[PDB]
Structures are given as C-alpha cells and as structure tokens.
TrEMBL record, chains A, B:
PROSITE patterns: DHFR_1, DHFR_2, THYMIDYLATE_SYNTHASE. The keyword NADP applies. GO terms for molecular function: dihydrofolate reductase activity; nucleotide binding; thymidylate synthase activity. GO terms for biological process: dTMP biosynthetic process; methylation; one-carbon metabolic process; tetrahydrofolate biosynthetic process. CDD domains: DHFR, TS_Pyrimidine_HMase. Keywords: Methyltransferase, Multifunctional enzyme, NADP, Nucleotide biosynthesis, Nucleotide-binding, One-carbon metabolism, Oxidoreductase, Transferase. This is Bifunctional dihydrofolate reductase-thymidylate synthase. NADPH 2 binds at residues 9, 54-56, 74-76, 113-115, 119, 143. Pathway: Cofactor biosynthesis; tetrahydrofolate biosynthesis; 5,6,7,8-tetrahydrofolate from 7,8-dihydrofolate: step 1/1. In the N-terminal section; belongs to the dihydrofolate reductase family. Residues 3-175 form the DHFR domain. The lineage of its organism: Eukaryota, Sar, Alveolata, Apicomplexa, Conoidasida. The active site is at 387. It catalyses: (6S)-5,6,7,8-tetrahydrofolate + NADP(+) = 7,8-dihydrofolate + NADPH + H(+); dUMP + (6R)-5,10-methylene-5,6,7,8-tetrahydrofolate = 7,8-dihydrofolate + dTMP.
C-alpha cells in the first residue's frame, strides 16, 4: 500500500491538456517540475513508476526517463522485456500490482492521457493530484483533463509564474477521508475577553474563508486580498462614517503582491482595468479636471465631482468637476497655490514625480524615494482627502523596483482592487522610465472597511476559487512617463470570474 | 502511562513562588488559569489528580477542589479516607501509582511547593510545565521554583497581561525526547531561483531565530521585533548608503504591539526610556533646538547636530545644533517659513497636533486622524529627513486609541526600539488628553536595515529569551498635552537584559 499521484498540466478553464498528440504549450519549467516531482523518493534503492497511455508514450519519443520506470498501458504494444526501464500492461487495474508485489517501487505516478486519467479517477486509485493550471483558453484542444471529483480537496495553490508571457499555477489536491498549545491559548482567551489581543483578531470562520481546504498552502497572492476580506468580515466593528452607508471596519492591515512573474489584478471578479489606467495617467499628467476623465468614459470621479456634492461639502464656488488640488496636483505641484483647473501651473509647486524618477535612476540605494499626497495646507480645498496617502519606492540589488503604499482608508469592495492594480501599473511605468524590472508591491492599510451594501456581493466573491494572475506588458518604451497611452498596454491571459456590481457610497 | 504537568506561578528573575506560607501576589486571572488548566480533561468519567505538599495543602485552607482529586504528600498527615476528594501519600514515588493502576485519573498535575517541584523534576516524572511568569522582583521571597532543566524546551509564550499594574506571562515547556506541500514548495523553489517570491523571503535559519523551540507559540509581541531582526539577517541585501557604514536591508515589513495590557518596551536589551520620552516631548513642544535635548543629558541628536556634519551636508551657515524644520516643527508649524531655532514660530504653520486632538475627541469615527512629517518644500533645510514619516490614529467602538506608523527607514539596532516606545508613549498621551484607553500600535517599515557594525551585538540580543513587557502609568492628568514631565511617568516591572552598546552611524 503505497502512494499514487496524478501529475497533470491542464488549461485553467476548459481543462485541456493536449492537441494533435502534443502539448498546447511550451513551458520548460513545467517539464522541470514534472521531472522533479516524479523523481521524488525517500529510498535510494527504489525507483518511481510513471503510468501513461500509449499515445503519451509516443509523445515522449518512446524513450525511457532517467531513474524512473515507465509503465505503458496498451492493448497492442508487445510486452517487450529487452528494456528494463519500460514495461507494458494490458489494462490499468493489472498495472496496479506494484502495491502487492514489486517492493522496489516506492511511489506511483499516473501521468497518461485523458483515457488514463479518467479511468484512474473512476477506479478510485488516486490519492493525490499535482495540477498545473495554464492560462491559455483561446486555442484548440482535443484531449481534456476530467473534472476533479468532489472527493478531492485543494490543499495548496502556488503563486502565479510567467513563461513566454504565459501565466501558470501549481496546485495539490488530496483525497479527504500539538494540541496543548491550542488548548492553552483557548483557555487564556476564555479568561481575558478582549484583553488578549488574539480575540480582537480572531481567525475567520470557515463559512467566510475563501477555499477553506487550502490551510497551509495559501501561496497565491490573491489570498492577500481575500483573507483580508475574511478578516474584516470576522472582526469588523460596525461603524458609521461620513456617508449614510455604515461599514464594518478594522485597523492596521497589509497585503503583499508579486510583480516579477505576474500582475496583481484580481481574478475572482472582472476588474475595469481601462478606468484604472486612465485615472493613473490622469494623476501622472498633473490634471485635476474631472471632465477630462468623463470625456474618456471614466466616471469614477463623478460621484465626488457633482455640483450637489461640491456645494454640500462647501465648495459651491468651484466649477462642475473641478476637484481641486488632489492626487496628481500634489505629485507635480506640491504646495502650489491652487486657483482653478484651467490655470497653467507649469513651474509652480514641487514636482515630486520628476524628482522621484531622477532619484530612482541617479541614486538607487537611497532610502528617500517618497511620493506624498497628504498636504495639510491644501486639505480644505480638496474635494476628497487623499486615500492612498504615502508611497515609497525601493531598488533592489538586482535592479528591481518594489513599492510600498500606505492608504489611510480602504474600501475593500471597490477601492482596494483599483488601488492594487493602479499602483502596480505605476510601479511598472516608473521601472520602465528608470530602466528597472518590476519588483514587489506592499500595501499598508489603516482603516480597512467594507460597506454594508456590499456584504452580499463580497461574500459571493469569497465563493470563487482564485485563478492565476494575468500578465501586463507595454507595447513601446516611452521617453517621458507622461507619454503612456491606453493602446500601449497588453493584458495577457486574464480569465476572471464574472463581474460583480457594487454601488459606490458618495 | 498518562501525562504529568507542573503548574507553577513564579517571578520572572528569582523564580520566587511564595512568602510566609502565602503567595507574593494576588492575580485573580492566574487562579482562573490554574482552575481551567487543572480541570482540562477529555473524559467526563475521569478526574484529574493535583499533587501538592503539606504546606501548600495548608495554603488552600485544607479544603478540596471541585472536580479534582487532591493528593497531599506528607509524612505526618493521617491517611484519612473520609474525604474522597483528598488522599495522603507518604512519598512522591508512591503517589505516582495513577500511571499503573487507578484508570479513573486522566492527567496528573504537580502543584506543590519547592520541595515537591524539585524532586518531581529530579526524579524525572514531569512531562510538561505550565509556568506563569510574574514581573515582581523587589519583594521578599522564601520559596523558589527550581531552575528548569535543559531537558525541557519552551514551546509557547503568551502575550503580556496586566493585573493591578503587575505584568505577567504564560509559557509552556515540554520535555524533548502534510510533507507533500513542503516538498512541492521546496521543488518549486529549486526551479525558480528568486522568481518565486518565497525565496526572496526565506524563513530564518535556526541559528539566527530567537528561541527557536517556540515555533507555533510566538504570541509575545516582542517576537514581532526579534523575528524581523532574524528576517533581516536572513534576507538582508548588502547595500551602501549615505554613511560609510553599509547595511543589510530588506523592504516592506510590519510589527504589531499591544498597549491595552502591557507597554512595548523591549526586554532583551535595557532601553534608555528617559531619552525616548525627552525626545518625544521635545517633538510635542514643537522644538528644533538640539541643545535643549543636550542640556537634559540626551545625546541622541548630537551626531546629526555637529558643526562638521552640518558643513558636510551643506548647512555650514546653520548654528551648532540647529537641526532645522524636522519632527515637531512639521507637527506644530507645517509649511512654516523656518529661519533659525531661536525665532518664535507660534502662529505660523499648520498645527497638525492640535487639529489631531480636536478631531480625535470631536469626531472619533473619522478616518483622517493623520499626522505627517514629510514636507518636500522643507526637506532641504532639515539636518535629517523624517524617518517615522506618517502616523494615523483610530478610535475603536470601545473607546480605545490605536496607532499606525509608517517609517521610511528603520535602523533595527538603535532606531527601531526607540520608535516603538516613542509612538507607544505618544499614543498613551493622546489617549489621556482625549479621554481614551491605549489600543494597539502597528508600525509599517519600508527600508528595514541592520548596520554592519551591529551584527555582533544584535546576534547577542537574539540569544536572550524575552521577558514580559512592563507597564507605563501616568501620575497626573494634564490640561494640555505639552505639560507632561519625566517625573509624571511610572515604569512598573521592567526587568530587561543588560544594555547592548551600539554605535550610531552619522
Ligand atoms: N498536459 C499533460 O499533463 C499531459 C498531456 N498529454 C497529452 O494528451 C494527449 C494524449 O493523450 P490521450 O489522447 O488521452 O491518449 P493516451 O495517452 O491516454 O493513450 C491512449 C492509449 O492507451 C491505451 N489505453 C487507453 N485506455 C486503455 C484501456 N482502458 N485499456 C487498455 N488500453 C488502454 C490505448 O492504447 P492501444 O490503442 O495501443 O491499445 C490507447 O490508444 C497528447 O497530446 C499528450 O501530449 C499526455 C500526458 C500528459
Ligand atoms: N506560586 C505557586 O505556584 C505556588 C506557591 N506555593 C507557595 O510555596 C510555599 C510553600 O511551599 P514549600 O515551602 O516548599 O512547602 P511544601 O508545599 O512543598 O510542603 C512541604 C511538605 O510536604 C511534605 N514533603 C515534602 N517532601 C517530602 C518527602 N520527600 N517525603 C515526605 N514528605 C514530604 C512535607 O510534609 P510533612 O512535614 O508533613 O511531612 C513537607 O513539610 C507557600 O508559600 C505556598 O503558598 C505553593 C504552591 C504553588
Ligand atoms: C509529453 N509528455 C507528457 C507530459 C508533459 N507535460 C506534463 N506536465 C505536467 N505538469 N504533468 C504531466 N503528467 C505532463 N506530462 C512529456 C514530455 C517530456 C517529458 C520530459 O522530457 N521530462 C524530463 C524533463 C527535463 C527538463 O526539461 O528539465 C524529465 O527529466 O522527466 C515528460 C513528459
Ligand atoms: C495556594 N495555592 C497554590 C497555587 C496558587 N497559585 C498558582 N498559580 C499557578 N499559575 N500555578 C500554581 N500551581 C498555583 N498554585 C492555591 C490557592 C488557591 C487555589 C484556588 O482557589 N483555585 C480555584 C480557583 C477559583 C478562581 O478564583 O476562579 C480553583 O477552582 O481551582 C488553588 C491553589
Ligand atoms: N467611497 C469612495 N469614494 C471614492 N472616490 C474615488 C474612488 C475610487 C473608485 C474606484 C472604483 C470605482 C468603481 O465604481 N469601480 C468599478 C468596480 C467594478 C466591480 O467591482 O466589478 C466594476 C466596474 C467599476 C468601474 O467604475 O468601471 C469608483 C471609484 C472611491 C471609492 O472607491 N470609494
Ligand atoms: N543613522 C541614524 N541617524 C540617527 N539620527 C537620529 C537618530 C535617532 C537615535 C536613536 C537612538 C540613538 C542611541 O544612541 N540610542 C541608545 C541606544 C541604546 C541601546 O539600545 O543599547 C542605549 C542608549 C542609547 C542612548 O543614546 O541613550 C541615537 C539616535 C538616528 C538613528 O537611529 N540612526
Ligand atoms: O483610491 C481610493 N481608495 C479608496 O478606498 N477610497 C475610498 C475609501 C473611503 O470609502 C472613501 C473616503 O472616505 P474617507 O475620506 O472618510 O476616508 O474613499 C477612495 C479612493 F480614492
Ligand atoms: O527615528 C529614527 N528612526 C530611525 O530608524 N532612524 C535611522 C534610520 C536610518 O538608519 C537613519 C536615516 O538616515 P537615512 O534617512 O539617510 O536612511 O536614521 C533615525 C531616526 F531619527
């Protein structure tokens, strides 16, 4: 009685694995993963058995794999005894004799075609599943991986990796069938009610924990957002705010995202990337005219740019969508005497973005690459105080650009995905203009809150198992950071779950 | 063969447990912990045995404990059979008969005096140790807990709790005698070198992990600092900076600290708390004169206030210790035209601190309680740009004041403990002025680095097992936040390891 694992690489949606007798992709790292996982063994005097169909045996050139015994399931291939590393069996059930006799086999790997996977799961011989999800779906398939039965549960999901602009994941599925520390902590929590800090940050209940079966393998960095969602649902205090829509809020959280091998755009919900880019390039250009965003069919600043909202916050003198000195005005004209959105501020104010770029490419090991938007003097003139307040940038020894962001208030339903994608795109732009590669993105959140009219929606978003991140590439290298256009961005391999409508609280 | 656990409450240093036949403290929560841990049982048809000496049996009033069988070790007490909840044994070895016969006993708890603990450990009958460390040491003891033998290792250390201004801990010691997920992650790390984000944040090696035996029980929040120290030692990239002393640096980290039941002042090193307080009140008063700190025998700002350092950074015109518009000038006079440290700036600039207090006590549920020190216009005039750049404050539904701090650059050897204690004291001051209780302190670090001249020292600090946090109390309620004086602070139960000299990099 030894272990049996199905090793497979399938597409993310349709679960296709092959086309015309070959793989529908060329990912060398996946072959390396196959080689390393099939050579995994605890005994040096034992080999691992790789069961495969005849057509798969043809796909590998009918040659043996080193340090492994290949078992071909075929009703026509002659049971050749010349090659000791390859043996042929007439059916799959008879091939499962390594459990009974043949003690020189330690682990068994089912890695054949659809005709092998299907009746290896049907006969219930499989204990584990090493699945490699690949983000290709607009191509042609003819061989698919069967839907994983409900008897299996996912226990691990790696981060998203990139190869030839193709995104891919790694997942493990298992066949589901020291307590003293836990008991002492539970007793100490029963004693001190909310005096033990652990009770103020309770672990989220399973009913609001996205993919609860993945406990110790939450490597995919979209979990940095979903687990924050769950923590707010679990420990969020019901509080009122400036809007009539109350929220559930907690304080002091963080999220990490990788940008070397992927792009942190959420897959559990289709995110409007064009509006994000237009807002970001609007910031970079130094503009505060909301009509310029509305003309480009982007209405995220319409709620805070209506005449009624401006007269209500005491800015009735201001023009329709003249938002005042906000994001992008403090970036390019910090401490500049603001008049209207039509004046020419070229020259006035401290151009933080230009100095940031100059410092990033002239003195990388510096610790002062800081872009601030919090200006106490101009706060009263703002239509909305800065939410993403502070940002710091960092150059690694291998010429990568990482970014930290401190955000005073985060609306996890609408503001958070936009902030993640926006600062990722900004880091990528800064890295290209300065000549670096994108690094990591850390977002530090003060007041992380969920509006109460989003509870039905966000819960739905927590019911969707995450898919690998897409890739974001630039079609041309620009000379100045302001020269970016929407046509320059290529979004590759983004297959998210359907969009989830949520109303903005004005 | 069942489990045996020594339950004891001892002082942190001398390990005293009693005085003149009674306890040297009255901590009700510890008695509740005793009651809950000795009644912990998996079988309802079984009782737990509590072994104690005769003098301890006298200390509990010679009355039985509910749902438990008390075993008194005494050579004089008559073996009375009237009370079924109390039994007398002549020696400790004969009392260890519940292992052989008497299957109605599930767990055994050694809870006697020094004379029982010593030869319960000497005879090696003890499997576990539930130790309650109490931070009282300037009192009189007459009964001590023996030094825990090397066969035991700590596996858990709770957070610091407070009762009657007394700090205390909870620790567990044990007698030392799914792998697929780990193997898959190791293989994925072998494939992608530093492309897998996990490899850029490797888990610290045991040789640089403070108290490595405590794996799953690092609850004490001084570990939030020691684990960051270890992570910098593990993943720190060797980088140069403005000073000749190079560092090992990483980017994007955080630390959490509780302030409801303790005070985050490091115990692994004696920290000069008075200098921290004097710097903080110097900030609050709006001062930029380094001579005011030097006159109070505080020399932390002498390196950045020397004539040579000012002439080197291009401020040779400036006076001796005139540091320029820095912390506390941006707090009280933001965007204020700075001249020298002798002028009267009362009135000019935006008083961020006053508005902060006003917003904290007039509009608590607000999300804009923000104090910034990063001013791009005044950066050139500063002797040293702000390290603790931004701070946000938050009022919970139970009227507690929590604080987030973003620090762009952190010197984990000298700057970090000072920053932790300083912002803790500042949060407590704001809480008293606004009428709240202290909450939590979250510190977010951008460039967390360790100077190479501190490597010998900090490693030493990582060899010291943490002791419970102290308490910090105020002797009087002040009318204005600037009225605090050093004589108003009482530091209770601070018993740190000896101080570790480390040179500041100018
Ligand atoms: N992405 C991935 O992880 C993998 C993808 N693939 C791809 O899949 C494609 C090929 O797979 P597939 O089309 O399913 O073909 P198979 O690899 O499953 O091989 C099928 C052959 O195996 C024999 N066989 C199958 N079932 C039985 C049975 N119940 N009893 C006896 N013999 C049996 C038959 O051989 P015979 O006719 O001689 O009797 C049959 O022709 C290729 O593109 C390949 O590259 C393959 C492996 C892994
Ligand atoms: N902080 C804490 O967790 C605890 C503190 N304490 C404190 O400690 C103090 C008391 O402890 P302590 O001074 O050590 O006294 P003990 O509680 O250990 O009791 C000692 C008695 O136990 C009997 N005894 C001990 N060893 C033997 C032996 N080898 N053979 C036969 N009989 C033995 C003797 O009784 P006899 O003379 O009758 O033969 C002896 O006088 C008190 O202040 C108490 O409150 C007590 C428990 C817990
Ligand atoms: C056609 N085929 C089937 C195949 C391909 N990709 C897969 N990918 C996955 N994730 N799982 C599978 N079962 C799988 N099977 C192949 C093709 C090549 C090799 C192969 O040459 N493996 C080398 C790997 C060498 C390398 O590139 O470093 C080895 O050492 O095993 C294996 C199976
Ligand atoms: C003198 N003595 C010995 C004593 C006291 N404190 C300790 N504290 C600790 N952490 N560990 C011990 N072994 C210990 N032993 C005592 C004194 C009172 C009770 C007691 O009354 N316990 C009640 C507690 C009831 C309560 O106040 O909630 C119980 O239900 O067990 C026990 C032991
Ligand atoms: N309170 C409050 N004030 C705010 N002021 C400015 C913002 C920034 C901001 C971000 C996003 C939106 C939005 O509506 N985003 C979308 C979400 C989805 C989705 O989730 O499926 C689909 C489409 C869109 C879209 O607009 O294309 C609107 C504003 C903001 C805020 O976030 N909160
Ligand atoms: N690079 C660089 N520039 C800096 N400019 C200003 C600072 C702030 C600052 C904090 C602390 C000290 C110090 O020396 N602190 C002590 C530490 C210990 C100890 O923990 O052993 C014991 C005593 C003292 C003490 O002075 O009483 C000196 C400056 C600073 C910095 O931190 N780094
Ligand atoms: O990028 C943004 N992210 C974000 O989360 N908000 C939301 C947070 C909050 O719901 C609202 C501001 O409310 P307040 O000003 O009171 O913090 O804006 C706004 C942005 F522009
Ligand atoms: O409160 C402080 N905290 C702190 O960590 N530093 C350290 C961080 C760094 O070692 C140095 C700042 O120099 P630079 O900004 O050039 O990195 O001072 C200084 C303070 F005043």
């Amino acid at each position: 009685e030894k272990n049996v694992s199905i090793v497979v690489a399938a597409s993310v949606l349709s679960s296709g694995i092959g086309i015309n007798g070959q793989l529908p992709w060329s990912i060398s790292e996946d072959l390396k993963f196959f080689s390393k996982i099939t050579n995994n063994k605890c005994d040096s005097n034992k080999k691992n058995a790789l069961i495969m169909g005849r057509k798969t045996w043809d796909s590998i050139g009918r040659r043996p794999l080193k340090n492994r015994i290949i078992v071909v399931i075929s009703s026509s291939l002659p049971q050749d005894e010349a090659d000791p590393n390859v043996v042929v069996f007439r059916n799959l059930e008879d091939s499962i004799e390594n459990l009974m006799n043949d003690d020189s086999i330690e682990n068994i790997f089912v890695c054949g075609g659809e005709s092998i996977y299907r009746d290896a799961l049907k006969d219930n011989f499989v204990d584990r599943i090493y699945l490699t999800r690949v983000a290709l779906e607009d191509i042609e398939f003819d061989t698919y991986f069967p839907e994983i039965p409900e008897t299996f549960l996912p226990v691990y999901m790696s981060q998203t990796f990139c190869t030839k602009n193709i995104s891919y994941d790694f997942m493990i599925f298992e066949k589901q069938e020291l307590k003293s520390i836990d008991d002492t902590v539970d007793l100490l929590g029963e004693i001190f009610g909310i005096r033990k800090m652990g009770n103020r940050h309770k672990f989220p209940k399973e009913e609001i924990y996205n993919t609860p079966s993945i406990r110790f393998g939450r490597e995919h960095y979209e979990f940095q957002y979903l687990d924050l969602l769950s923590r707010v649902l679990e420990n969020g205090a019901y509080r009122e705010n400036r809007t009539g829509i109350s929220t559930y809020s907690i304080f002091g959280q963080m999220m990490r995202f990788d940008m070397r091998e992927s792009f942190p755009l959420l897959t559990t919900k289709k995110v409007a990337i064009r509006s994000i880019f237009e807002e970001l390039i609007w910031f970079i250009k130094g503009d505060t005219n909301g009509n310029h965003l509305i003309e480009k069919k982007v209405y995220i600043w319409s709620g805070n740019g209506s005449k009624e909202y401006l007269e209500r916050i005491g800015l009735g003198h201001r023009e329709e969508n003249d938002l005042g000195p906000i994001y992008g005005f403090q970036w390019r004209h910090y401490n500049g005497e603001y008049k209207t959105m039509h004046d020419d501020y070229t020259g006035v104010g401290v151009d933080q973005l230009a100095k940031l770029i100059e410092t990033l490419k002239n003195n990388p090991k510096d610790r002062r690459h800081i872009l601030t938007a919090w200006n106490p003097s101009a706060l009263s003139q703002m239509a909305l105080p800065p939410c993403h307040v502070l940002s710091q940038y960092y150059v690694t020894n291998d010429n990568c650009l990482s970014c930290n962001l401190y955000q005073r208030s985060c609306d996890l339903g609408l503001g958070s995905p936009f902030n993640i994608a926006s600062y990722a795109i900004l880091t990528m732009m800064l890295a290209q203009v300065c000549g670096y590669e994108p690094g990591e993105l850390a977002i530090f959140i003060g007041d992380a809150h969920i509006y109460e009219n989003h509870l039905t929606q966000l819960k739905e978003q927590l019911s969707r198992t995450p898919r690998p991140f897409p890739q974001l590439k630039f079609k041309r290298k620009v000379e100045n950071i302001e020269d970016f256009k929407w046509e320059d961005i290529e979004l590759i391999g983004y297959y998210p779950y359907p969009t989830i409508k949520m109303d903005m609280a004005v």
